[PDB]
Amino acid sequence: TGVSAEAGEQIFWGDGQCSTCHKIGSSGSATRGPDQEGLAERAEERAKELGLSSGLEYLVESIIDPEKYVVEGFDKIMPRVYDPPIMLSREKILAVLAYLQSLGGEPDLDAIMKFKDKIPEASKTKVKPWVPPLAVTAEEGEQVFFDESLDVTCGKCHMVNGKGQKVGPELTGIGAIQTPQYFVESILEPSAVIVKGYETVFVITADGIPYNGLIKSDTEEELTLILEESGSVEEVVIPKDEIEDMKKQEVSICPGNIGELLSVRQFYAVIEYLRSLK
Ligand code: HEC
Ligand code: HEC
Ligand SMILES: [Ca+2]
Ligand SMILES: [Ca+2]
Ligand SMILES: [Ca+2]
């Protein structure tokens, strides 16, 4: 499809997977990462603050080394899209950069092409294949994911293709986006990265009653929280007019002792299942 902002648009909303986390104003609905409307102008300001040569260089850096600068208000969730699973080609990354420049700026093809030697080549990825130390299958991991008899049941909070209960984010298609290393960290260090919007809020009512949990739904008159305890959940509906204070906390209700509740085999099988969610 070549290096053009028009090709980059197809990739951003296509196999670049960018629109699974980013929206552009009212285009798209994803909120995992920053809204990219006006990104071209924003990048110029980040480049000045960070000592880079241009906003375009900041955009390049944001793709090749997502962890190097973390936008305030977000965690380190953006994958290196040139690595598996996405394995976005160098030509596709250049096209995406042209599209990003068009978000409030003008694409500069000559300038973009000069960064080609800085974009890692997906075919030459340094990532070693993911091979669990036991034989496990994705089908085995699906059984674990939904097993209600275990001390932890992912399906109590996560939905996949219409199955499971919606508390945390739906995981449909996540294996097309994230690495097994991210899945390991999500399960064993759940509060290390918190999907945007799934923070725990600490609420205090006028009567002095505390409620700590995830906001399920927030309307004009009622706030519904999901409380978590020992992998079990419960909903409470709090009248808004009874809320005295509320404070967001950078902690997750994705359970913190999964490493103690799953066997080695269950753990690696669940990871295989997630990888298979394409
Ligand atoms: C969710 C798993 C993401 C995917 C898929 C993509 N991006 Fe992302 N991006 C994400 C987050 C949480 C953040 C903020 C934290 C950080 O790493 O800085 C970002 C940031 C960017 C930026 C910088 C934006 C800014 O305001 O400075 C850019 C330019 C960007 N991301 C680009 C981008 C592209 C082109 C993607 C598809 C190839 C893409 N991202 C996917 C989360 C996620
Ligand atoms: C309710 C008590 C949950 C249970 C049971 C499980 N998860 Fe969870 N998960 C939950 C929340 C509220 C969030 C968002 C905040 C955060 O910690 O990031 C998550 C997140 C994840 C993710 C990241 C999803 C993403 O889109 O990036 C993963 C991969 C994940 N959780 C995996 C997972 C597994 C394997 C579980 C069973 C062992 C599991 N979760 C249970 C809430 C809850
Ligand atoms: Ca970044
Ligand atoms: Ca997490
Ligand atoms: Ca209770």
CB distance 273 to 171 below 8 Å: no
Q: What is the C-alpha separation between 211 and 176, in angstroms, rounded?
A: 36
Q: What burial class does residue 182 get, using C-beta atoms within 10 Å of its C-beta: 0-12 exposed, 13-18 middle, 19+ buried?
A: middle
Could you give the count of Cα atoms lying within 13 Å of 48 in the half-sphere of its Cβ? 4
Token match 């992912």: residue?
154
Residue nearest ligand 1's atom 5 by CA: 18
> How is residue 151 annotated by DSSP?
S
Give the H or E element holding residue 249. Answer: strand 243-249
How many CB atoms within 10 Å of residue 276?
A: 14
CB distance 150 to 261 below 8 Å: yes
DSSP E strand stretches across 171-239:
200-205, 210-218, 222-229, 232-239
CA-wise closest residue to 68 among 129, 32, 118, 109: 118
How many CB atoms within 10 Å of residue 270?
A: 24
Domain edges within the chain: 5-124, 138-193+255-275, 200-249
Beta bridge partners of 243: 205
Task: Please state whether the peptide bond connecting residue 120 to the residue before it is cis, i.e. omega within 30 degrees of 0.
Answer: no
Q: Residue 221 corresponds to which tokens in the numbers above?
A: 């008159």
Which experimental method was this entry solved with?
X-ray
Q: Does domain 200-249 have CATH number 2.30.30?
A: yes
CB distance 271 to 183 below 8 Å: yes
b/e 113-151 (16+ beta carbons within 10 angstroms → b): eebeeebbebeeeeeeebeeeeebebebbbebbbeeeee
CA of 143 to the centre of ligand 3 (A): 35
Residue 44 C-alpha from the chain's centroid: 25
CB distance 179 to 168 below 8 Å: no
Q: Is the dihedral of CA 217, 223, 227, 233 positive or negative?
A: negative
CA of 19 to the centre of ligand 1 (A): 9
CATH code for the structural domain at 138-193+255-275: 1.10.760
Q: Which residues form the pocket of ligand 1, taking CB atoms under 6 Å from any ligand atom?
A: 16-18, 20-22, 32-34, 39, 42, 46, 59, 62-63, 66, 69-71, 74, 77-79, 81, 96, 100, 177
Amino acid at 41: E
Q: What is the C-alpha separation between 222 and 149, in angstroms, rounded?
A: 33
Give the H or E element holding residue 65. Answer: none
Q: What burial class does residue 65 get, using C-beta atoms within 10 Å of its C-beta: 0-12 exposed, 13-18 middle, 19+ buried?
A: exposed
